[PDB]
Design an enzyme around this catalytic site. Structure first.
Site, short mmCIF file in Angstrom:
data_model
loop_
_atom_site.label_atom_id
_atom_site.label_comp_id
_atom_site.label_asym_id
_atom_site.label_seq_id
_atom_site.Cartn_x
_atom_site.Cartn_y
_atom_site.Cartn_z
N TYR A 82 0.77 -1.29 0.10
CA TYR A 82 -0.07 0.05 0.02
C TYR A 82 0.88 1.26 -0.11
CZ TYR A 82 -3.44 3.40 1.20
OH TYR A 82 -4.27 4.67 1.21
N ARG B 2 1.50 7.94 13.59
CA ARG B 2 1.02 8.92 14.12
C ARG B 2 -0.20 9.43 14.14
NH1 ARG B 2 0.64 13.46 10.46
NH2 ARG B 2 2.64 14.38 10.51
N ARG C 124 -11.32 4.81 9.19
CA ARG C 124 -10.31 4.32 8.10
C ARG C 124 -9.09 3.65 9.23
NH1 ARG C 124 -10.98 9.33 8.70
NH2 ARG C 124 -9.61 10.80 9.54
N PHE D 34 14.81 19.83 0.24
CA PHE D 34 13.57 19.42 -0.12
C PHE D 34 13.37 17.96 0.25
CE2 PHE D 34 11.07 17.08 -3.09
CZ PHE D 34 9.96 17.30 -2.65
#
Ligand code: FPS
EC number: 2.5.1.21
Lengths: 334, 334, 334, 334, 333, 334
Positions: free
Chosen positions: D136, D183, D193, D253
């Site tokens: 997933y 978290r 969910r 980034f």
């Protein structure tokens, strides 16, 4: 001021009379490592070359060449070649190799190791197909590129990334090899050795010796072409490789050769002379006359300028066209 | 936009034929400093060179030269050489000199003094020993090399070490001086001057002037080779001096002239043309045909390739054969 | 993996043996922008040259050329010029123009609109005054330098000032243009084109086609030198400009074409042959021998050497003698 | 001058609390490329969590999302999520996606196509096995790292390797995604969910929603530690990935986000808080207060600091205490 | 080892806490050049400040201040300002000025010359239009930017293109100066000096001092917001200026004070404290907690993070709504 | 990968909260060479500490610790200090030592040998003179600087001068050391350990312990200031030392502590809390809030900044008020 070293550099300017200069331009510890590295694969090639040596004796020797680097008194005298001195006075070369840092030794040793195995793998057979023709070059040139790459990173004069990239470090080797092969064709023929991969020279004549025969010119040249269209696919990689280099000395050492080759394939392209005797590497356009091959933008333009010399002379009668254009068109938009 | 400075440059391109271009392409402050430095060194030279001058009146003008720069009205209408306007219009030259940051003046100063002294110290004698030869090249060229190194470190454009190592800076100068003294033999002889070291040419012929005689040409070449082999010893220094430079601008100004020199010695090596006419200096093969002297690695490849061009054209029966081989081996290994 | 962009580079080489190589060598996004900028410019130029097109038709096309950029389908099928491929397959080039970032689009679009307005303006006339020659060179070359500059800055590969200083960009344009207009004198006259500023050649002859007749070559070379003098006035700007570029690929793309221009101006200067055939661009001195145009200092030296090859050639008897020396002096003092 | 790109960057800041800044600080091309990639990925993600959309209706949308990029007017108005503006005004985003260079489109579109297929697979199902939890995560975060990675290598801003090595890229993705899941537990549970692999949380409680119950905290924290241990295994790859980066803007980034995750996994390790409210990322040691995450070594330091904060807190009575230690060790000895 | 040089740095630290540490961290000669430059500016600005000096006595001082640099014994003892140590002991500073290489002096003398003429031009009037706000901010800050740029370039440490870009250099200064004139409202008010553009505050109140009154607080914030919006427009140039730099010491020196000002505006935006006392600088959120203003990407990221803080608090009711958003929109795209 | 090397890193993290992180961040060979070093110094230190090891047994242990390095089986099982683990399992650490390049061993053993001797010399005495405070800090801190330094140079990641200039290296060491002796006055007092130079505190109180007394806080703090002032004198060297580093990992390792110590002295300066509890690092004022210690320019700035923190708090009524200003003023103008 070392008798052994000076002699080593006396052999470098002797055998590898084309690189010698730039090798001696390499910064710090990269200087000797490569000089010696060039002498050993020069010696390793001489053994594989020398045909007065049995196959069942050459093979063993080939396989263990990498072990002799630690045999103070190893040597070869029965070698009857022009470069036989490297074998004869090898102990001198091994001594200095033995004074190279361990990080450089491992690499050189490791490359001789596999280069050998491979050289032997093609000691009783010919270059079968294209797909196979790469395996050979990979063994006699490709691996060299990888080794050089690992020496650069190992010397920490270049980014660790140059070593990792071997697929390209390989193309760098395959391009030159394929070039030289394709260049000194008659020389290899008049020498008793065939190198042009089968499955390709076949579809032209019945023996790639016929190409040295006058009433062949046509099939002769045409084969040459598609043989070049094959080599040109390495440009994209050669450009990528050089584009990563960050050291000037290293850039020259890698760049110059690659550029002489393109200059070579641009002169050999469709040039019948490739069978008469020799071809002169005529330079590029009246623009790349103020650009030496020392900065990437210059190199590229120089390549592009040669790609034009070729794309220009591409004849339709040729069954190698289309692809010849398909590759050059790609080097332009990359 | 100084009507005077604009004059100075006119004079620079009117005398320093082989340095004007690189001096003008020097960054900011070195541009005017180095330019003036030439115009004065020219003056102090165009004097020593004017024989019309009596030795009684010449000697003074030399020592008292490092203080004419500070004498606004000085001139020397009494000259008949070629570069005379650099003395007759000397004030315009001296003027601009006072316009340079005292640190630049301090260098151009302590030299014209040290030079006219050494220059004077030779007005009578000839070069005798090999050692006495360097000594002369020192007063005439070695000083220039040092004063430049001073200027380069002064401008802050280069590390302070360049101007500190007076030795390397000296070699830089000597190599250029000898190559000329060697090259311009016939012209000097015809002129009436003899810069070739006596303890060398006397081991071949009675008068240094005999080398002009077509009958003694074979001996003349042997001496050439000997002197040339001498000059080759400054190379290791030259490379070292050149690799420390950090400024592109400065590098060009330094490297090109050395390179032009190395190219020159290789042109003249074992070449009778040095005693009949003028030698045309050309480049390396196709490897050095792809490079330029703007970056160190490339410069090295050129230097290394000119050496090999010499090493190959060496006669076994030449008196200095092994001396030549020794230093060229030193160069390729070091 | 786009046949449209590939096709473009095909056209780029089919029509720019003068730049295609240094264009394809440009970094990242400047590559496509400059390639396509060049193509529509080339296509616009083929229109402004196509003589088999009535002014009562060519004008609007030149005026609205910029707009055909946003029209997927626009194209010109009724052209008989050499590079008509770009007009016939314009949808392919325009398609790619629309694929470029929007900032390069507004730049190329703006120059194409301004250049057409100018072009149409000079269809019905000749260059009269020397200030019209400027205005005309501005429309066909000057705006190209501004456009190129605007793009270089737009990409951030170059400082923003490079684009902002349109004045210096313009010089770059005018310098390359005037040169060509001078070197191509004979080619232009043998083709019903009047490019030399008639307010000049009219003080030397009656018809511009008289410089062809050998009975007036003396007045010709005399006119020839006046123009070459006029153009030399741009060199300072050329230097100011090149001295700003910080990206190597871009530096090469700009400096090379400029150096070539000068070399030409220095060969055509006072050279009679201009009015008999083509002039042969010699070499870069014997000093500029070991240095190429890939770094500013070098490009500086190179430029000054040519400034001398012309200075040591000014006939005191030429009416331009003063201006010529004047400017060559300005150029070297800076 | 583009108001739609401004709108895009407005959405980037409304939808990306965490990345807008580092994205906008990206160099040149990567700026818009990443911004827009982030925005289409946002829309794809919003279509996925939207629970008022039936499953049969949602598959065709997730499957064809990549294709709508090229449907100028496509939009979705039936979403009730909060970031649904990106779908309601998707035409504006796709506009600018089509304005990107094709080399980026190919990358962004491909990652969209495969991410859709994947999001579709897990609609009707729940995450069970760790190997599935990984699957997933690859579909929602892994492919994003691969995307970005291929974008960096295409812009030539980063090495060709960054993009080719997809495992490391996927590691970066999984590590961040796994962290949020670990978290956002409570916040997710209070939504409907479930993302915590079943084979794990199940062996602790009957219903994932049980960890919510205050009478299970012991099993709550124990499970929490198992998953975190699972997460830590990506750090070796994370560190390897980041150490190949050479562009500062991109390094920022990439690292910042990762150090953030790690700081979170640290503050969460064995912390009952995860099941009651949000956990506060309390900065690490005193040594890090003087360090920033902009250079590789400092990031090495920061990570190692966080490892210790976790190691010093590993309670022996933890089902995975021998796992947690064994991995941090491998991190410390790498 | 120089006693007068030693003294100069003592003065640098007494009069300019916000820059002393970054100035001393500057490479080579830039260090002494920027130190002295700050000291003479400190004096020139102190003369302009002293409101106990007549305008007719003050005009000559500002006009000829630059020549004073070359008058070894010149000094001023009638100052009542608190930074007058440099004025009373100007001969020490001037001595070290004539010590700096010439190329530096020529730049420092030129800026003092031009700043003289300008400070003098405004002793008579108040800043009215925003346009005049720039001209004024130009004379007291922009020229300091231009001077700095030229000093960097002259030192060779920075590129020639840096000191050549006067437009962006000017911006760096206008930006810093506006952030302060703004932030220091209540402070400038109790001193009798007015720096807020009249053509602006006049649309909100009768006397600029009215913003000091608690029943104008609403009108006050709206003005404060218009001005901040005005200051924000310099950020693009600032980002362009900073990007050009290549030397670390020079970067930290230019960046930090800009980031600080950015931080300041962020904290003052639509904040009443401005009119009641002091506004303390909040710092970085989640991304900033691992970034510092010592590299361009990091600099940008912080600035974007700040622009966002302001954007999030922009009330749709504030008459500067669309401008405030419009500018942040240019800054992030 | 080796189990012993992992074990070593476990110990590093358990016995080094202040360097474990920065050390593991080090590049190449330095990583391990420094880990082992810390471990063996850590042990030797734990021996010195352990107050249950009689002087009779301790002296031999200290003097011979360095030899215990080459003895495979040596171990110590009677320690009672918490870090005793590195002693009981010493063979594991000594095994790794023996795997470091011989050159790293020469350094580690010499520092151990010298350190032992010196620690033994201070066993039955305290620090009297300041001259003696220096010799002590040398034997326990300074020599560590020399070690680390000698190590960085051996690895060649730093220039040879870093290892040569032992005085500057000693300073880096003493500064951290002196600072700690300060900050920890009370913690040590509750340990019967006295490090504050007797010849200094003797002049304020009668017994070093009288400072814990509330009525002596006045004299207490005065003495504090003197020492802090003493410490400041090393800063010049610190700056010098740090400015010489070329590697980022090494810069971080060395910078962080130094900056941390300066912050500790600023916080302690004239702060009566030194004698009442623990003082935490006040936040980098304003100008220092946006700066990390990863680049030299920033480190100077942070340092100069903390200097003022002190400079501001100096009262005219402090006996050492004048010396504190003096030294700082020297730091400012260098
Ligand atoms: C980069 C910059 C700032 C300025 C340069 C501006 C340029 C490129 C101007 C156009 C100049 C001309 C007339 C070029 C040759 S035309 P041609 O290409 O048709 O001639 P050819 O026959 O191909 O050599």
């Amino acid at each position: 001021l070392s008798s052994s070293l000076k002699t080593c550099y006396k052999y470098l300017n002797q055998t590898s009379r084309s690189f010698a200069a730039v090798i001696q331009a390499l910064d710090g510890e990269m200087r000797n490592a490569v000089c010696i590295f060039y002498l050993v694969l020069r010696a390793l090639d001489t053994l594989e070359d020398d045909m007065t040596i049995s196959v069942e004796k050459k093979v063993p020797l080939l396989h263990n060449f990498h072990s002799f680097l630690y045999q103070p008194d190893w040597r070869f005298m029965e070698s009857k070649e022009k470069d036989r001195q490297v074998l004869e006075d090898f102990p001198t070369i091994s001594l200095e190799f033995r004074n190279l840092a361990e990080k450089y030794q491992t690499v050189i040793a490791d490359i001789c190791r596999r280069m050998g195995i491979g050289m032997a793998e093609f000691l009783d057979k010919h270059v079968t197909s294209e797909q196979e023709w790469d395996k050979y070059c990979h063994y006699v040139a490709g691996l060299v590129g990888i080794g050089l790459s690992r020496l650069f990173s190992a010397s920490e004069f270049e980014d660790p990334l140059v070593g990792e990239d071997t697929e390209r470090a390989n193309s760098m080797g395959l391009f030159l090899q394929k070039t030289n092969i394709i260049r000194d064709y008659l020389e290899d023929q008049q020498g008793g050795r065939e190198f042009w991969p089968q499955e390709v020279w076949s579809r032209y004549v019945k023996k790639l010796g016929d190409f040295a025969l006058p009433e062949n010119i046509d099939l002769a040249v045409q084969c040459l072409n598609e043989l070049i269209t094959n080599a040109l696919h390495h440009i994209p990689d050669v450009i990528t490789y050089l584009s990563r280099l960050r050291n000037q000395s290293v850039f020259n050492f890698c760049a110059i050769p690659q550029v002489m080759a393109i200059a070579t394939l641009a002169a050999c392209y469709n040039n019948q002379q490739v069978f008469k005797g020799a071809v002169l590497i005529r330079l590029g356009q009246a623009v790349t006359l103020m650009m030496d091959a020392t900065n990437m933008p210059a190199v590229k333009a120089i390549i592009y300028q040669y790609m034009e010399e070729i794309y220009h002379r591409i004849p339709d009668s040729n069954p190698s066209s289309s692809k010849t254009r398909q590759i050059i068109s790609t080097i332009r938009t990359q």
